[PDB]
Each structure stands twice: as C-alpha cells, then as structure tokens.
Amino acid sequence: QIKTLHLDIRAREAINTSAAGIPLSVVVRIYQLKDNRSFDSADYQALFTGDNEILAGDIIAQKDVWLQPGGSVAVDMPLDDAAKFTGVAAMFLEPDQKKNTWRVVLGRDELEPDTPRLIEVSGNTLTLLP
Amino acid sequence: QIKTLHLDIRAREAINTSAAGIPLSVVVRIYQLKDNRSFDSADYQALFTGDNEILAGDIIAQKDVWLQPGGSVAVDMPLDDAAKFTGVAAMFLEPDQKKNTWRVVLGRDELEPDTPRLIEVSGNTLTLLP
Amino acid sequence: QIKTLHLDIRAREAINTSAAGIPLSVVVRIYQLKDNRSFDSADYQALFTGDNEILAGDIIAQKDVWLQPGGSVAVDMPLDDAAKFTGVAAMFLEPDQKKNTWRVVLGRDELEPDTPRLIEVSGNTLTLLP
Amino acid sequence: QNNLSGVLHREGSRWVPDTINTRGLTFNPAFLKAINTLSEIADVAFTTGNAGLHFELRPGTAAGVMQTTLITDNQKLIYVNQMPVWKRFTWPADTEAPGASLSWVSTQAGTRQYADLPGSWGLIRLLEMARRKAAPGVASGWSLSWQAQDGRMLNYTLRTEAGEGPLVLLKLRNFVLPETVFELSGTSAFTGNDEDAGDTVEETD
Amino acid sequence: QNNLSGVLHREGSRWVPDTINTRGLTFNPAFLKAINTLSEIADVAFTTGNAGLHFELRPGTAAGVMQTTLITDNQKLIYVNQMPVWKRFTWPADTEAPGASLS
C-alpha cells in the first residue's frame, strides 16, 4: 500500500484572521488513527485540550506542524501500517464547530506513496486539492 | 552511511573565564536529534534547565562529556540511525545567546565513520575545524 | 608552514609583585617581526616607550593581551607570512634588563598550526613550555 | 484601638476623625491619607492573615507574533493563538523557584525571554512596566501592553476579583509612613484630591 | 506583662525601661541586653509560632574546582559552573533524614 506519509500544506496570507483582520499564524496537528468514528465525535475543545483517551488511544502518533501566514511546511512522515486514517485538525481563532470546516479525515486509499497530497488553508477553513 | 559517532574535543587554557579571568572547567552535552528546528529555537535557559519535551522527545539520547581546562576527551558513541543531527551545546559562565556561539549542529553528512571530527573550545565559543 | 598564530598564556597568582608583595596585573605585547636583531638590541625603555621606528618598521603588526593575576587569555592571531619572529615582551614593575628574562623570541619553526604554544608567567619572568 | 481610642473610631475600612467630640485639636492630613492607603491594601490582598490573593488571568491576542509564554510560580500559560480561555493564578504559591518571566517567539527568530525576575515579590516587579491599562470591556476591565523589543507588542486583558486585584500593590512605591500626628502646622489646607488624581494619571497613562 | 507591667512597656521590638515614673530603682544592664537579643531572635526567625524562616540562596564562582554540592533538608544544590541563578531554602523542613553536608 502506502509506506511513507507525504503531505504538502499551502497557506495564503489571510488565514486565522482576528476581529481586526490581522493575519495570524496557526498550529496544525497530524494524527495517525486506528478509528475515525471518535475523530468525528469530538468537538473543537475536547480534541485540542481534552483528555479523551479513547480518542488519544486510537491516535497512534501525533505530530504538530507550524506554518507561517503565506507559506508552507513539507511533511515527511514514516507512515504506520495501522494508521488507517490521517487526522488533520487546526486551531483557528474562530473554529466553526457546526459546519465542521476545521477538520478533514484522509483514509488509507487517498494517500500517494511518493507524492504529497495538497492541503490548502484559507480564511479559517481546511481545503483539499486533487 | 555513518555507523559510529566519533568526536574529538580540544580545549585551550582560557575557556569559560570568569570576571577574574580564572580558567574554569565546563560541561558539554551531546544530543542525538531527529529534528534540528527545535534545537535552533531553544535559548540557553530552556535547553539546559527547561522542560521542553518537544525538544527532549526529539532528543533520542543525550551524553555529557566533561573536559578540563587545557585538555581533551574522546567521544566513542554508537551512532543511532535516526540521529540526523548531532547537537553540541555548552554551558559557559557568559553564554552569548544573541550571536549564538554556544551551540553547533552537525548533520548526518559531516560525520566521519572512522575519524573524529574536531571541536575546539576557546574563550566562550564553540569552533569546528576541517 | 604555519598559517594561524596560536598562543596560550598561563599565569600564577604571584606575578609582577610590588615591594609590598601585592599581586598585580600586567600587560603583554605580541609582535610580528621581520628582523630579530633589533628586537634583541632594544632595552626595556626604548621598546615600550621609545620611537625606534627601525624596530617599529620591522614590527609588521602589534597586539596587546591583558591578563589577570591567576588567569589566562587565548591568542588567535591570523599569522602573517613575513612574520619570521613572534616577539613576546612584558612590562613588569621590576624588569630585569640585564638577565633578560622579560622577553622571548619565537621563530617560524617553533610554532604549531593548530595547537597553541604555552607561555607561563611567574614572578617577573617569562617561561616557555614544551 | 487603645492609644487614641476616643479619636479614630474604626469605620468601614477607612479611619474617620470626627469622633473626638472635641475642639482645638486637628492633626496632620499626611497621616490620614497614609493610613487609608494601608487599610485599602489590608482589605484587598490580605483577607486571611496568611497574605495571599488570587486573580483571574488573561488570554492572548497578538499582531504578527506567536508563542507568547509567561511562567510564574510554576503556573504556566503557553499560548499559540488557540481559542482564548481564562486562567486562575494564586499569587503566593508553595515552595518552588519563585519568580516570573515573559518569553515570545518572533517571526524570524527563536525564543528570547523579555526579562526574568527572581524572588517571591517578582510578579509585582515585572508588571510595573506597561501601565497603559484602562479597558472598556469586562467589569474590572484592565489590559496590559508589555512593549518588548523590536516593535513586537503582546497584549493581555486582566480581569480581577475583589476591588482591584494585584494591581493595588503598585501603590506602595515611594511610600513612607509620615511624621507627626497632632501637629500645630497645617491648619487650613484642602488636599482632598490626590487620592483621585493619582488614579487619574494611572488609569489614563 | 503582669509581674512588672508598670515597669517595662512593650515598645517596638525591644524593651524600654524609662516608663516606671519612679525614682530610686534601677536594674542590672545584663538583663536589659539579654532580653533585647532574645526579642531580636523573636522577630526574625519566629513569625507564625511554628518556628521557620526561609532565605535566598548561593550560587558559586570558584578557582580551580568544580562540582560544588550542598544538601540541606532534601533540597539539593548541584553546581557545575552554569549560569549563576538564585534558589530558595526553607530552613525547618518536613520529615526526612534532616541534616546538612558539603561535598
């Protein structure tokens, strides 16, 4: 299947803008899951600050990337074989927990073994690209 | 690549001199890193006394050498394969945190498998040699 | 030959003692000579205060180190190629001009390119070490 | 309570003079202000004898800077532009290495700490330097500027509990217990505005 | 406070003698010094009855010696010529093997 996890994270200038419209940085976390159901059950608060060890136990490993406004950070991760779902979540100033534009789940099939998949951050949303 | 970490640490008589010019000893630590970005982000204080476990978790192993003023200590270390960066940091009385002459990063490529690379300590600075 | 001038200057506690036996500091000067004959002809007075420009013209460059009683100062000098003789002279309270224990001449051959030669100051004399 | 107990009746938190039922004896107004300030310290910070208050603390809002970190009394506040959520800090803690510091991460550099101040009285030392404070938000409504080096500023918005919180401890600077009470000098003087004017200069600058 | 309450008034931290309003009766100066020293002990170490002070600490700067270590009451200070930074000792501690040494 896929041996090495490759991700490329783009970012425009207007990301995580405050009430003054100020371009702010953001912290994005990468999760290697055995279960995706608990990753779809947690809210914004119990995922980044909570002690849901049912979700944390399904997290095999976690790695935090840290991108400037208007830049990019490449992800070269030795992908675990039990990592059925690559959990991508971000911490905006205004995370829309309702419309759920702050997290995406990338399964085993949608990875590429020698090409990074492109995740673009804009405004306060997460966006994939073909 | 490189199997065994070999380092040779020279020292003159005037190292880590106090306000009275007195030749003092010093403690040097060797770090085996998976990441060099956090090794370039920490200051003098949070590296030697801090609990930056993000940096400490990237430290695979640590070993502390301990040299006299005007002497040398040979380093024969079984080099880990994930140790992409050999972190060398020292604890002077006056560590210039600004000009950053108190730490060096030696990558995977600049090691020699059967010859120690030469690190010379003088004054309160760290110096490599070809 | 030798590219970089390296010198290490040790000092005990009893250096340049006055009539009250008080440990005093001292000023040592380093000279890069083209001629050693005029460096052996000048006395204590015309070298440190005189205008012997025949001797000063043979001095390519001069650098003054400044050591505490009971300490050391490392010398990292980019050695000139015409500097055939490294002139070392000191200014004690009681410079014995007769027995000439206040100056030494280090030629081109007795330098080491990556190791400092050791000059030890004690009492009011200058002493080399192998 | 016993040396002049017919003169100053304890009343509320201040000290009221008009209880002598006596004429022909005033006293120095330099005394009566300097005891009112001390009792206002006595009823904000020291409520149980053991000399400890606690005050809610601050989230961060920044402009071109991130990883605003402060440590005091092993009560960390690390902050990387998450959702802003309050904290609660007891000011005299248990045994530790007691002190305080501020450290930020610039866009083009690593961590460099602003200033670390050791000792149990450190939190009131490093908080002196940005008294641009008055804020029209929450009830006790205070903010802090902390203009560090190279133009990067890091904001905070302080919300206290009982009166003024730990900002009232700045009133002790340049404060000496005065001279005489019951002095003949100072017969006619109306200086009942400094207790408003010092906070006027404080809460505007 | 009750055996000679008109003679020695408690004043500040010492004991002032000249409030007897009485003549023909003076006392030994040894007593007046030996109570002043004891009240100076009473207003430095013993503030809350439980008899404990605390005091800031000592870094080192030496000459030809390293690894200066002292222990008191399981509160270590190990020192290998780092940046000198103060620390804090409470002098009577909890249950331990209480003692002190320098190595």
Side-chain angles (χ1 to χ4, degrees), chain A residues 2-130, chain B residues 2-130, chain C residues 2-130, chain D residues 1-93 95 97-205, chain E residues 1-93 95 97-103:
Chain A
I2 312 297
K3 181 190 170 183
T4 313
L5 199 59
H6 295 288
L7 282 178
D8 215 347
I9 311 166
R10 276 287 307 274
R12 311 177 196 267
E13 281 289 332
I15 45 159
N16 205 359
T17 67
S18 72
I22 290 173
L24 289 170
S25 309
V26 80
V27 178
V28 189
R29 302 189 195 162
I30 306 301
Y31 289 116
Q32 290 169 340
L33 307 158
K34 292 175 184 178
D35 166 79
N36 58 338
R37 268 83 66 190
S38 182
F39 203 81
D40 301 339
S41 300
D43 60 336
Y44 165 73
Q45 195 170 2
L47 177 55
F48 293 115
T49 52
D51 281 320
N52 45 6
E53 303 172 351
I54 316 164
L55 184 49
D58 300 337
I59 292 155
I60 311 168
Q62 56 180 358
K63 185 185 176 184
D64 308 340
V65 288
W66 182 78
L67 56 94
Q68 315 307 110
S72 52
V73 160
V75 174
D76 283 327
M77 200 175 203
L79 172 52
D80 195 85
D81 314 326
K84 286 199 63 58
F85 303 96
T86 301
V88 171
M91 276 164 285
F92 305 101
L93 255 188
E94 197 183 4
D96 197 1
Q97 323 165 359
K98 178 175 173 63
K99 294 181 184 64
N100 211 5
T101 76
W102 63 278
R103 63 177 176 187
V104 293
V105 177
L106 273 71
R108 168 66 54 192
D109 53 354
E110 296 163 351
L111 313 168
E112 290 294 323
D114 283 326
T115 305
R117 288 291 304 270
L118 202 63
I119 295 183
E120 199 177 7
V121 187
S122 181
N124 46 5
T125 61
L126 297 186
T127 311
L128 295 172
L129 275 185
Chain B
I2 312 297
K3 181 190 170 183
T4 313
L5 199 59
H6 295 288
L7 282 178
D8 215 347
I9 311 166
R10 276 287 307 274
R12 311 177 196 267
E13 281 289 332
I15 45 159
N16 205 359
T17 67
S18 72
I22 290 173
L24 289 170
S25 309
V26 80
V27 178
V28 189
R29 302 189 195 162
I30 305 301
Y31 289 116
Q32 290 169 340
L33 307 158
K34 292 175 184 178
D35 166 79
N36 58 338
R37 268 83 66 190
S38 182
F39 203 81
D40 301 339
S41 300
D43 60 336
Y44 165 73
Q45 195 170 2
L47 177 55
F48 293 115
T49 52
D51 281 320
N52 45 6
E53 304 172 351
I54 316 164
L55 184 49
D58 300 337
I59 292 155
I60 311 168
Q62 56 180 358
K63 185 185 176 184
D64 308 340
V65 288
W66 182 78
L67 56 94
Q68 315 307 110
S72 52
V73 160
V75 174
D76 283 327
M77 200 175 203
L79 172 52
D80 195 85
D81 314 326
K84 286 199 62 58
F85 303 96
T86 301
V88 171
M91 276 164 285
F92 305 101
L93 255 188
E94 197 183 4
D96 197 1
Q97 323 165 359
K98 178 175 173 63
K99 294 181 184 64
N100 211 5
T101 76
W102 63 278
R103 63 177 176 187
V104 293
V105 177
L106 273 71
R108 168 66 54 192
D109 53 354
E110 296 163 351
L111 313 168
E112 290 294 323
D114 283 326
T115 305
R117 288 291 304 270
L118 202 63
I119 295 183
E120 199 177 7
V121 187
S122 181
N124 46 5
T125 61
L126 297 186
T127 311
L128 295 172
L129 275 185
Chain C
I2 312 297
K3 181 190 170 184
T4 313
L5 199 59
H6 295 288
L7 282 178
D8 215 347
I9 311 166
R10 276 287 307 274
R12 311 177 196 267
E13 281 289 332
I15 45 159
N16 205 359
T17 67
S18 72
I22 290 173
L24 289 170
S25 309
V26 80
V27 178
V28 189
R29 302 189 195 162
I30 306 300
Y31 289 116
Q32 290 169 340
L33 307 158
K34 292 175 184 178
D35 166 79
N36 58 338
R37 268 83 66 190
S38 182
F39 203 81
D40 301 339
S41 300
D43 60 336
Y44 165 73
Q45 195 170 2
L47 177 55
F48 293 115
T49 52
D51 281 320
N52 45 6
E53 303 172 351
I54 316 164
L55 184 49
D58 300 337
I59 292 155
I60 311 168
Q62 56 180 358
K63 185 185 176 184
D64 308 340
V65 288
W66 182 78
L67 56 95
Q68 315 306 110
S72 52
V73 160
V75 174
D76 283 327
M77 200 175 203
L79 172 52
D80 195 85
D81 314 326
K84 286 199 62 58
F85 303 96
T86 301
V88 171
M91 276 164 285
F92 305 101
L93 255 188
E94 197 183 4
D96 197 1
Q97 323 165 359
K98 178 175 173 63
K99 294 181 184 64
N100 211 5
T101 76
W102 63 278
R103 63 177 176 187
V104 293
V105 177
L106 273 71
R108 168 66 54 192
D109 53 354
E110 296 163 351
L111 313 168
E112 290 294 323
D114 283 326
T115 305
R117 288 291 304 270
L118 202 63
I119 295 183
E120 199 177 7
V121 187
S122 181
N124 46 5
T125 61
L126 297 186
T127 311
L128 295 172
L129 275 185
Chain D
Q1 268 146 15
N2 55 351
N3 288 313
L4 68 164
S5 83
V7 172
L8 314 167
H9 269 88
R10 173 173 185 85
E11 181 159 359
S13 64
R14 291 158 313 126
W15 304 83
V16 187
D18 200 359
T19 41
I20 53 187
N21 306 313
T22 318
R23 47 157 202 90
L25 184 58
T26 180
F27 53 91
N28 192 9
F31 169 79
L32 208 58
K33 183 191 166 190
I35 302 305
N36 269 10
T37 296
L38 286 183
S39 183
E40 265 162 2
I41 301 304
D43 279 350
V44 164
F46 299 169
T47 76
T48 47
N50 297 324
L53 65 94
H54 66 262
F55 61 102
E56 310 290 325
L57 188 138
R58 285 86 78 182
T61 42
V65 78
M66 76 302 296
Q67 189 95 36
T68 80
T69 55
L70 63 90
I71 318 290
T72 167
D73 280 323
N74 307 151
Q75 308 166 9
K76 305 197 172 294
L77 185 81
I78 183 174
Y79 173 70
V80 284
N81 305 292
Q82 321 180 338
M83 202 166 65
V85 164
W86 315 107
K87 216 64 176 178
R88 167 182 169 167
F89 280 53
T90 183
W91 166 60
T95 178
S101 50
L102 182 69
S103 49
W104 82 102
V105 175
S106 283
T107 308
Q108 61 264 21
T111 84
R112 39 182 312 162
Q113 65 265 45
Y114 167 77
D116 46 341
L117 275 303
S120 62
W121 198 265
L123 190 147
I124 305 302
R125 192 170 313 181
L126 61 88
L127 176 137
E128 174 75 34
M129 305 175 271
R131 279 169 84 166
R132 193 177 320 275
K133 278 195 313 296
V138 308
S140 62
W142 279 317
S143 90
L144 302 174
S145 295
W146 287 353
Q147 187 197 347
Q149 329 281 339
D150 51 66
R152 306 280 188 270
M153 74 188 310
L154 68 164
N155 286 334
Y156 279 132
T157 303
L158 162 64
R159 191 193 75 134
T160 73
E161 289 272 317
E164 285 87 3
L167 290 185
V168 76
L169 277 179
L170 291 199
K171 257 166 188 297
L172 304 171
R173 302 255 279 140
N174 274 309
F175 167 77
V176 185
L177 277 190
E179 52 264 8
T180 173
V181 316
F182 297 155
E183 204 201 6
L184 193 143
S185 184
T187 74
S188 185
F190 284 157
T191 53
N193 53 350
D194 192 77
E195 76 267 10
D196 209 5
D199 309 342
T200 285
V201 185
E202 161 176 355
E203 297 303 311
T204 53
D205 290 331
Chain E
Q1 274 157 16
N2 51 358
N3 280 315
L4 68 166
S5 78
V7 165
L8 311 174
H9 281 112
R10 175 180 183 86
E11 179 154 13
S13 47
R14 290 166 315 147
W15 300 82
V16 182
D18 203 359
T19 48
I20 58 187
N21 319 315
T22 317
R23 52 156 200 90
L25 183 53
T26 197
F27 63 96
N28 197 4
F31 168 80
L32 201 52
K33 188 189 174 187
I35 299 307
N36 266 10
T37 288
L38 280 189
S39 184
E40 261 167 0
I41 305 302
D43 273 347
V44 165
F46 307 154
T47 71
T48 56
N50 298 327
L53 63 95
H54 60 256
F55 56 103
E56 302 295 323
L57 196 140
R58 280 81 67 204
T61 44
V65 74
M66 75 301 288
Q67 191 90 36
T68 77
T69 50
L70 65 95
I71 317 294
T72 176
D73 274 337
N74 295 168
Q75 293 159 14
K76 299 196 172 294
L77 176 76
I78 175 179
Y79 180 62
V80 289
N81 302 302
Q82 320 187 351
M83 201 169 64
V85 171
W86 324 107
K87 203 84 170 176
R88 171 163 170 166
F89 278 155
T90 175
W91 167 60
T95 180
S101 53
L102 176 85
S103 52

XYZ file of all heavy atoms in Angstrom, chain E residues 41-101, unseen atoms left out:
459
model
N 15.858 37.745 68.175
C 15.606 36.409 67.638
C 14.118 36.181 67.403
O 13.740 35.574 66.395
C 16.177 35.325 68.565
C 17.656 35.569 68.811
C 16.017 33.943 67.974
C 18.460 35.605 67.559
N 13.262 36.697 68.282
C 11.819 36.523 68.164
C 11.209 37.218 66.956
O 10.121 36.826 66.528
C 11.126 37.042 69.421
N 11.850 38.251 66.413
C 11.269 38.957 65.275
C 12.036 38.757 63.970
O 11.925 39.586 63.066
C 11.138 40.448 65.575
C 9.836 40.783 66.264
O 8.940 39.914 66.283
O 9.703 41.914 66.777
N 12.807 37.679 63.841
C 13.444 37.308 62.584
C 13.093 35.881 62.188
O 12.634 35.628 61.072
C 14.975 37.495 62.648
C 15.652 36.784 61.494
C 15.319 38.965 62.622
N 13.280 34.937 63.102
C 13.039 33.534 62.808
C 11.588 33.126 63.037
O 11.028 32.366 62.243
C 13.959 32.658 63.657
N 10.967 33.607 64.110
C 9.682 33.074 64.565
C 8.619 34.121 64.268
O 8.405 35.048 65.049
C 9.688 32.724 66.057
C 10.803 31.810 66.488
C 11.254 31.849 67.789
C 11.381 30.901 65.620
C 12.264 31.023 68.209
C 12.398 30.076 66.031
C 12.836 30.132 67.331
N 7.941 33.966 63.141
C 6.909 34.913 62.762
C 5.505 34.377 62.958
O 4.581 35.163 63.181
C 7.081 35.315 61.301
O 6.719 34.208 60.472
C 8.522 35.677 61.031
N 5.319 33.060 62.876
C 3.993 32.457 62.945
C 3.871 31.403 64.036
O 2.936 30.597 63.997
C 3.621 31.825 61.600
O 4.634 30.885 61.221
C 3.481 32.885 60.515
N 4.797 31.361 64.991
C 4.765 30.390 66.060
C 5.351 29.037 65.707
O 5.977 28.401 66.560
N 5.185 28.594 64.463
C 5.663 27.297 64.008
C 7.162 27.260 63.758
O 7.675 26.204 63.369
C 4.921 26.893 62.737
C 3.436 26.744 62.961
O 3.000 26.343 64.039
N 2.647 27.067 61.944
N 7.854 28.387 63.948
C 9.311 28.470 64.055
C 10.023 28.042 62.772
O 10.742 27.046 62.732
C 9.812 27.669 65.261
N 9.802 28.818 61.716
C 10.514 28.598 60.475
C 10.720 29.835 59.630
O 9.772 30.584 59.383
N 11.948 30.062 59.180
C 12.257 31.133 58.247
C 12.614 30.540 56.891
O 12.720 29.323 56.728
C 13.389 32.015 58.781
C 14.799 31.470 59.026
C 15.717 31.703 57.852
C 15.390 32.132 60.240
N 12.814 31.418 55.911
C 13.341 30.997 54.624
C 14.168 32.129 54.040
O 13.906 33.304 54.296
C 12.238 30.562 53.652
C 11.245 31.630 53.333
N 9.981 31.652 53.878
C 11.318 32.696 52.504
C 9.322 32.696 53.411
N 10.111 33.347 52.575
N 15.158 31.757 53.236
C 16.222 32.663 52.843
C 16.721 32.290 51.463
O 16.790 31.109 51.124
C 17.379 32.638 53.852
C 17.980 31.268 54.103
C 19.181 30.907 53.531
C 17.385 30.375 54.981
C 19.740 29.668 53.793
C 17.940 29.142 55.234
C 19.122 28.796 54.639
N 17.073 33.302 50.677
C 17.552 33.068 49.328
C 18.943 32.456 49.362
O 19.600 32.376 50.400
C 17.570 34.360 48.524
C 16.224 35.036 48.427
C 15.218 34.216 47.658
O 15.608 33.565 46.669
O 14.031 34.227 48.038
N 19.412 32.052 48.197
C 20.429 31.027 48.149
C 21.669 31.560 47.446
O 21.769 32.744 47.127
C 19.831 29.770 47.507
C 20.348 28.333 47.513
C 19.145 27.453 47.688
C 20.998 28.021 46.188
N 22.620 30.664 47.223
C 24.004 30.958 46.922
C 24.400 30.246 45.639
O 24.383 29.003 45.593
C 24.885 30.473 48.072
C 24.951 31.364 49.281
C 23.779 31.203 50.206
N 23.732 29.919 50.861
C 22.602 29.416 51.324
N 21.482 30.086 51.152
N 22.585 28.248 51.932
N 24.759 30.933 44.611
C 25.446 30.254 43.519
C 26.937 30.286 43.773
O 27.372 30.862 44.771
C 25.045 31.081 42.313
C 24.967 32.464 42.877
C 24.480 32.338 44.289
N 27.741 29.706 42.888
C 29.162 29.629 43.117
C 29.958 30.271 42.001
O 29.557 30.288 40.841
N 31.093 30.835 42.391
C 32.152 31.224 41.472
C 33.457 30.807 42.128
O 33.751 31.241 43.245
C 32.150 32.732 41.182
O 31.959 33.458 42.403
C 31.054 33.115 40.184
N 34.229 29.967 41.451
C 35.339 29.310 42.125
C 36.661 29.520 41.402
O 36.746 30.333 40.477
C 35.040 27.823 42.265
N 37.700 28.801 41.823
C 39.029 28.928 41.230
C 39.716 27.570 41.261
O 40.321 27.203 42.273
C 39.862 29.973 41.969
N 39.636 26.836 40.156
C 40.284 25.542 40.069
C 39.534 24.413 40.734
O 40.153 23.424 41.137
N 38.211 24.526 40.861
C 37.396 23.474 41.455
C 36.001 23.532 40.842
O 35.493 24.597 40.487
C 37.379 23.577 43.006
C 36.528 24.711 43.508
C 36.939 22.293 43.625
N 35.407 22.360 40.652
C 34.092 22.247 40.041
C 33.316 21.187 40.803
O 33.882 20.481 41.642
C 34.198 21.883 38.565
C 34.571 20.442 38.346
S 36.151 19.961 39.075
C 37.302 20.791 37.988
N 32.020 21.081 40.488
C 31.067 20.206 41.183
C 31.042 20.512 42.687
O 31.481 19.727 43.527
C 31.346 18.721 40.895
C 30.266 17.734 41.346
C 29.227 17.464 40.295
O 29.527 17.409 39.109
N 27.994 17.271 40.727
N 30.572 21.714 43.007
C 30.299 22.093 44.385
C 28.862 21.713 44.705
O 27.929 22.236 44.089
C 30.512 23.589 44.595
O 29.395 24.302 44.062
C 31.758 24.047 43.883
N 28.680 20.800 45.652
C 27.364 20.286 46.006
C 27.111 20.495 47.488
O 27.975 20.184 48.314
C 27.251 18.797 45.691
O 28.377 18.114 46.250
C 27.217 18.571 44.200
N 25.929 21.008 47.824
C 25.468 21.025 49.204
C 24.041 20.516 49.268
O 23.227 20.785 48.382
C 25.550 22.415 49.841
C 24.718 23.593 49.348
C 23.431 23.767 50.135
C 25.540 24.824 49.492
N 23.752 19.782 50.328
C 22.412 19.314 50.631
C 22.021 19.908 51.968
O 22.828 19.926 52.902
C 22.336 17.776 50.695
C 23.115 17.140 49.547
C 20.890 17.310 50.709
C 22.529 17.406 48.196
N 20.798 20.416 52.056
C 20.171 20.612 53.355
C 18.682 20.333 53.237
O 17.998 20.892 52.371
C 20.443 22.004 53.950
O 19.722 22.137 55.179
C 20.113 23.148 53.009
N 18.227 19.395 54.072
C 16.819 19.047 54.254
C 16.162 18.616 52.941
O 15.049 19.034 52.612
C 16.072 20.202 54.918
C 16.171 20.152 56.424
O 16.410 19.060 56.975
O 16.018 21.196 57.065
N 16.900 17.793 52.185
C 16.470 17.204 50.908
C 16.121 18.273 49.876
O 15.186 18.122 49.087
C 15.307 16.226 51.092
C 15.687 15.006 51.904
O 14.822 14.243 52.320
N 16.981 14.810 52.126
N 16.876 19.370 49.892
C 16.727 20.467 48.936
C 18.101 20.671 48.312
O 18.957 21.355 48.876
C 16.205 21.720 49.617
C 14.787 21.573 50.126
C 14.451 22.567 51.210
O 15.169 23.543 51.420
N 13.354 22.320 51.916
N 18.313 20.065 47.153
C 19.653 19.957 46.616
C 20.101 21.256 45.967
O 19.296 22.103 45.579
C 19.727 18.831 45.592
C 19.399 17.468 46.147
C 19.857 16.382 45.195
C 19.719 15.007 45.820
N 20.631 14.837 46.982
N 21.420 21.402 45.862
C 22.040 22.425 45.019
C 23.300 21.792 44.426
O 24.335 21.686 45.088
C 22.355 23.701 45.782
C 23.095 24.704 44.899
C 22.143 25.349 43.935
C 23.823 25.733 45.722
N 23.183 21.347 43.195
C 24.302 20.810 42.439
C 24.750 21.899 41.477
O 23.926 22.647 40.944
C 23.888 19.508 41.722
C 24.994 18.975 40.813
C 22.582 19.687 40.968
C 24.638 17.686 40.114
N 26.057 22.041 41.289
C 26.576 23.215 40.607
C 27.851 22.874 39.856
O 28.838 22.480 40.477
C 26.842 24.317 41.618
C 27.361 25.535 40.969
C 26.594 26.207 40.042
C 28.631 25.999 41.247
C 27.066 27.321 39.423
C 29.115 27.107 40.631
C 28.327 27.763 39.718
O 28.810 28.888 39.100
N 27.844 23.056 38.533
C 28.956 22.656 37.668
C 29.452 23.803 36.792
O 29.865 23.573 35.651
C 28.560 21.450 36.804
C 28.462 20.215 37.659
C 27.220 21.711 36.151
N 29.377 25.034 37.317
C 29.692 26.291 36.614
C 28.738 26.542 35.447
O 29.149 26.699 34.298
C 31.150 26.356 36.149
C 32.123 26.212 37.280
O 32.109 26.991 38.224
N 32.969 25.203 37.202
N 27.450 26.596 35.763
C 26.420 27.047 34.838
C 26.241 28.556 34.998
O 27.080 29.232 35.598
C 25.114 26.298 35.096
C 25.287 24.833 35.408
C 23.965 24.104 35.476
O 22.904 24.723 35.446
N 24.019 22.782 35.563
N 25.162 29.104 34.463
C 24.827 30.491 34.748
C 24.326 30.594 36.181
O 23.401 29.861 36.555
C 23.776 31.007 33.782
C 23.730 32.514 33.655
S 22.706 33.034 32.276
C 21.113 32.424 32.817
N 24.912 31.453 37.013
C 24.523 31.518 38.427
C 23.129 32.101 38.609
O 22.851 33.224 38.190
C 25.593 32.428 39.036
C 26.181 33.158 37.904
C 26.118 32.246 36.743
N 22.247 31.320 39.231
C 20.851 31.691 39.453
C 20.498 31.337 40.894
O 20.844 30.248 41.363
C 19.906 30.968 38.464
C 18.443 31.182 38.816
C 20.142 31.433 37.035
N 19.824 32.254 41.599
C 19.404 32.012 42.974
C 18.375 30.889 43.065
O 17.772 30.468 42.077
C 18.785 33.260 43.598
C 19.399 34.536 43.200
C 18.868 35.466 42.371
C 20.648 35.059 43.645
N 19.716 36.533 42.251
C 20.819 36.306 43.027
C 21.645 34.589 44.496
C 21.943 37.087 43.232
C 22.756 35.372 44.702
C 22.901 36.601 44.071
N 18.160 30.428 44.291
C 17.164 29.414 44.602
C 16.664 29.710 46.020
O 16.882 30.805 46.549
C 17.774 28.022 44.386
C 16.813 26.879 44.123
C 16.433 26.809 42.676
C 15.681 25.532 42.391
N 15.186 25.445 40.989
N 15.995 28.755 46.660
C 15.269 29.061 47.883
C 15.291 27.875 48.833
O 14.986 26.750 48.438
C 13.828 29.447 47.563
C 12.945 29.565 48.764
C 11.700 30.324 48.423
N 10.737 30.251 49.509
C 9.675 31.036 49.608
N 9.441 31.952 48.682
N 8.850 30.903 50.635
N 15.648 28.144 50.085
C 15.692 27.156 51.153
C 14.699 27.554 52.231
O 14.772 28.671 52.747
C 17.081 27.097 51.795
C 18.076 26.260 51.064
C 19.428 26.517 51.207
C 17.681 25.210 50.267
C 20.363 25.755 50.562
C 18.614 24.443 49.614
C 19.956 24.712 49.768
N 13.795 26.653 52.598
C 13.074 26.793 53.856
C 13.853 26.019 54.907
O 14.345 24.921 54.632
C 11.621 26.319 53.763
O 11.015 26.390 55.059
C 11.493 24.905 53.211
N 14.041 26.621 56.074
C 15.063 26.014 56.916
C 14.561 24.824 57.741
O 15.255 23.805 57.756
C 15.747 27.062 57.793
C 16.552 26.442 58.862
C 17.608 25.599 58.708
C 16.370 26.607 60.262
N 18.092 25.226 59.931
C 17.349 25.838 60.902
C 15.477 27.340 61.037
C 17.458 25.780 62.278
C 15.586 27.279 62.401
C 16.570 26.510 63.009
N 13.416 24.867 58.467
C 12.901 23.599 59.006
C 11.962 22.922 58.028
O 10.912 23.478 57.695
C 12.175 24.019 60.292
C 12.434 25.472 60.436
C 12.655 25.974 59.057
N 12.310 21.727 57.570
C 11.534 21.067 56.535
C 10.601 20.030 57.150
O 10.471 19.917 58.371
C 12.459 20.433 55.501
N 9.951 19.249 56.294
C 9.086 18.163 56.729
C 9.942 16.950 57.083
O 11.172 17.030 57.162
C 8.056 17.845 55.649
N 9.297 15.803 57.298
C 10.021 14.620 57.738
C 10.892 14.075 56.611
O 10.496 14.057 55.440
C 9.061 13.553 58.275
O 9.808 12.403 58.693
C 8.000 13.151 57.251
N 12.104 13.698 56.973
C 13.194 13.394 56.057
C 14.281 12.733 56.890
O 14.039 12.304 58.024
C 13.702 14.655 55.358
N 15.462 12.618 56.324
C 16.624 12.468 57.180
C 17.255 13.849 57.289
O 18.035 14.240 56.414
C 17.606 11.443 56.618
N 16.935 14.625 58.324
C 17.350 16.030 58.339
C 18.799 16.203 58.762
O 19.272 15.608 59.733
C 16.392 16.666 59.349
C 16.061 15.572 60.275
C 16.195 14.262 59.541
N 19.500 17.040 58.008
C 20.911 17.264 58.222
C 21.462 18.089 57.080
O 20.718 18.550 56.215
N 22.778 18.256 57.084
C 23.392 19.075 56.054
C 24.837 18.649 55.859
O 25.492 18.194 56.799
C 23.312 20.561 56.412
N 25.324 18.804 54.630
C 26.699 18.462 54.299
C 27.116 19.221 53.052
O 26.280 19.704 52.288
C 26.876 16.961 54.082
O 25.949 16.482 53.128
